[PDB]
Amino acid sequence: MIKKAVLPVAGLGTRFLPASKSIPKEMVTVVDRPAIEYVVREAVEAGIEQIILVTHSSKASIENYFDRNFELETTLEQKKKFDLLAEITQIVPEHVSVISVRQPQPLGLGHAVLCAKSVVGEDDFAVLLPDVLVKDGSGQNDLSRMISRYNSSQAAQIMVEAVPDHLVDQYGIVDVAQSPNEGESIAMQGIVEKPPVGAAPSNLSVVGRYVLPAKIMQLLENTPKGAGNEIQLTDAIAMLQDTDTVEAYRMQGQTFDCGSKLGYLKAVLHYGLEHPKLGMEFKQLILELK
Amino acid sequence: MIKKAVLPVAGLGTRFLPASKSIPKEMVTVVDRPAIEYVVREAVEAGIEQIILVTHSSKASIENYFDRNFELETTLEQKKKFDLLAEITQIVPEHVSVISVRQPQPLGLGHAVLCAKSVVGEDDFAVLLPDVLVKDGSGQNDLSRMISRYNSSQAAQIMVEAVPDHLVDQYGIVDVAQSPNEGESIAMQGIVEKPPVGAAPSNLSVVGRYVLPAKIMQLLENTPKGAGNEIQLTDAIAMLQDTDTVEAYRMQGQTFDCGSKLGYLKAVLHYGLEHPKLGMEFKQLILELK
Numbered sequence: 001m002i003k004k005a006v007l008p009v010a011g012l013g014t015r016f017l018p019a020s021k022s023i024p025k026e027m028v029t030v031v032d033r034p035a036i037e038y039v040v041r042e043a044v045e046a047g048i049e050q051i052i053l054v055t056h057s058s059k060a061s062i063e064n065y066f067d068r069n070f071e072l073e074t075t076l077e078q079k080k081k082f083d084l085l086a087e088i089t090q091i092v093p094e095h096v097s098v099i100s101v102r103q104p105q106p107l108g109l110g111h112a113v114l115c116a117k118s119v120v121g122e123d124d125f126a127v128l129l130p131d132v133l134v135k136d137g138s139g140q141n142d143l144s145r146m147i148s149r150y151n152s153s154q155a156a157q158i159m160v161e162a163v164p165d166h167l168v169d170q171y172g173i174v175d176v177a178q179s180p181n182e183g184e185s186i187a188m189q190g191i192v193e194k195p196p197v198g199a200a201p202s203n204l205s206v207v208g209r210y211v212l213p214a215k216i217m218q219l220l221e222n223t224p225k226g227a228g229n230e231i232q233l234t235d236a237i238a239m240l241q242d243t244d245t246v247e248a249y250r251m252q253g254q255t256f257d258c259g260s261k262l263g264y265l266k267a268v269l270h271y272g273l274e275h276p277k278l279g280m281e282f283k284q285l286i287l288e289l290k
Numbered sequence: 291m292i293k294k295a296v297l298p299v300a301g302l303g304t305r306f307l308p309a310s311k312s313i314p315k316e317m318v319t320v321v322d323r324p325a326i327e328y329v330v331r332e333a334v335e336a337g338i339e340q341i342i343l344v345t346h347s348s349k350a351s352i353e354n355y356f357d358r359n360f361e362l363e364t365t366l367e368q369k370k371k372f373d374l375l376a377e378i379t380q381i382v383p384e385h386v387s388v389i390s391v392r393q394p395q396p397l398g399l400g401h402a403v404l405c406a407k408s409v410v411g412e413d414d415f416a417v418l419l420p421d422v423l424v425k426d427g428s429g430q431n432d433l434s435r436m437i438s439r440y441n442s443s444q445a446a447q448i449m450v451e452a453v454p455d456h457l458v459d460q461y462g463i464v465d466v467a468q469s470p471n472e473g474e475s476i477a478m479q480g481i482v483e484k485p486p487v488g489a490a491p492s493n494l495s496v497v498g499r500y501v502l503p504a505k506i507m508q509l510l511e512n513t514p515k516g517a518g519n520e521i522q523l524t525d526a527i528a529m530l531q532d533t534d535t536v537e538a539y540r541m542q543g544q545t546f547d548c549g550s551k552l553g554y555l556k557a558v559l560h561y562g563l564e565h566p567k568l569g570m571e572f573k574q575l576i577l578e579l580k
């Protein structure tokens with residue numbers, strides 16, 4: 001039922017300089033692979049079959065990462081690294097396609113989603129903001145649950161995360177009557193950007209994971225330039241409120257913002273430790289520090 | 291006076307896959323910046339003025355990193371973010387030049403250095419393998435001490451460090467009568483590549499920093515192949531021994547192989563704990579795991 005995801009990757013990422021001066025922020029090493037691999041894997045495991053990169057002319061390396069590399073593959077055969085060759089050959093399953101479209105100028109998350117209008121078609125679709133990483137624990141990730149909730153209700157889904165009461169002015173927080181249980185959705189009635197401490201309508205932050213109906217593309221074509229003179233996804237979802245129910249899905253797992261330098265380092269530590277091959281020896285490198 | 295360093299960066303480096311799949315192994319992010327910045331900083335802080343990259347068709351992103359990026363810089367001006375702008379424009383001082391030459395085919399380290407012949411001319415020169423990072427704690431870095439010593443002695447220098455007896459198996463090892471002290475050089479008879487664990491002439495590994503005379507280039511033209519990697523540098527250094535004193539310089543610093551997954555994870559930890567801004571907040575994140 002939900003088979004397409006739009007990853008908007010066209011932004012230059014001024015927040016993680018100089019690391020992203022000359023390679024995309026999305027290709028920042030996290031333990032042993034680029035950040036984007038963790039987001040694409042997340043999508044794939046939630047049953048996504050078509051990855052739609054809305055990208056920029058400097059971001060070839062993202063596209064090259066999900067494609068074959070002749071010179072790389074033949075030097076791996078020449079060195080008999082057959083296991084590695086099989087790992088870099090099958091980064092993504094056979095049935096998963098990676099499509100690419102250009103965002104002409106950088107005019108907001110809303111405008112980036114709109115650039116995928118022609119590939120989304122009449123299909124309903126997920127959005128995953130790739131600067132955010134999502135870590136699970138049990139089987140079936142937060143995006144899987146949210147998608148099957150969109151399928152159940154036919155209500156737009158907006159992934160949210162409880163944050164401490166003293167911090168809500170850093171986040172977009174949703175207006176909900178009550179807060180749902182982890183793994184569950186509630187009707188929401190708007191999102192407020194960076195509300196002042198003591199005046200926010202919930203502790204539930206917008207994360208950067210959406211499931212939206214195609215209808216939203218028509219709504220983005222009729223939303224005026226908002227905050228930062230940029231055309232805004234939150235403003236098109238406000239408009240969707242006029243005809244459709246919109247729910248906040250509260251995640252069971254934990255996020256990392258590989259857009260800040262400190263959220264990046266947090267992610268390396270948490271992914272490092274959990275690494276199926278390096279985790280133990282990484283923990284050991286930690287201990288030996290002091 | 292040693293002004294020129296050769297950085298052989300032409301090899302694909304299949305040991306830090308998949309990080310290095312679609313970006314150069316040299317651009318892999320260490321804390322907040324590509325690994326190669328640490329190596330170019332090492333050279334410049336030790337009086338280098340011409341950085342000679344011996345490079346490959348797939349590594350523009352390295353050249354770009356020490357160049358200016360028009361679209362990114364104006365994006366930063368428009369957004370009035372001038373402290374970031376300063377961190378991406380003054381990456382090396384005005385007086386330091388970064389030069390490119392192509393290694394046509396990957397025929398070994400010696401062939402890389404020989405590709406730099408036309409640029410180095412009649413001048414003496416440093417060689418830096420950027421896969422290895424070298425961290426100081428004195429205020430004079432090991433490359434500086436080793437150049438300072440080439441200048442007096444007029445003896446070629448090979449940076450070396452002591453390894454556990456059971457691992458001499460893994461490393462280039464120098465033939466020395468005796469171990470110099472941390473910070474000094476002894477005469478050396480040559481290098482044994484991966485000596486059998488019992489039968490090595492010392493515990494002192496070749497680290498990947500050299501200071502060599504111009505005439506090594508003629509020598510490199512008249513060395514045959516070695517380990518099916520046409521020209522080998524150590525063969526040329528042996529050929530040098532039949533004319534001049536060659537010395538082994540033992541380092542006071544510490545090393546990290548950013549090609550080995552654990553060596554890279556160790557550089558992230560150590561370099562992060564000592565970052566101006568993030569060190570204290572990073573130290574903080576590490577404690578919050580136990």
Ligand SMILES: O=c1ccn([C@@H]2O[C@H](CO)[C@@H](O)[C@H]2O)c(=O)[nH]1
Pocket residue numbers: 008009010011012013103105106107108109111112129130131
């Ligand atoms: O105009 C654009 C195009 C893309 N993105 C992407 O959306 C996320 C932040 O909103 C990041 O992944 C960024 O690269 C934007 O934000 N704005």
Ligand SMILES: O=c1ccn([C@@H]2O[C@H](CO)[C@@H](O)[C@H]2O)c(=O)[nH]1
Pocket residue numbers: 298299300301302303344393395396397398399401402419420421
């Ligand atoms: O043919 C070769 C062999 C090695 N190297 C470089 O030498 C260093 C150590 O072998 C690495 O950074 C590798 O890229 C080259 O540039 N070309």
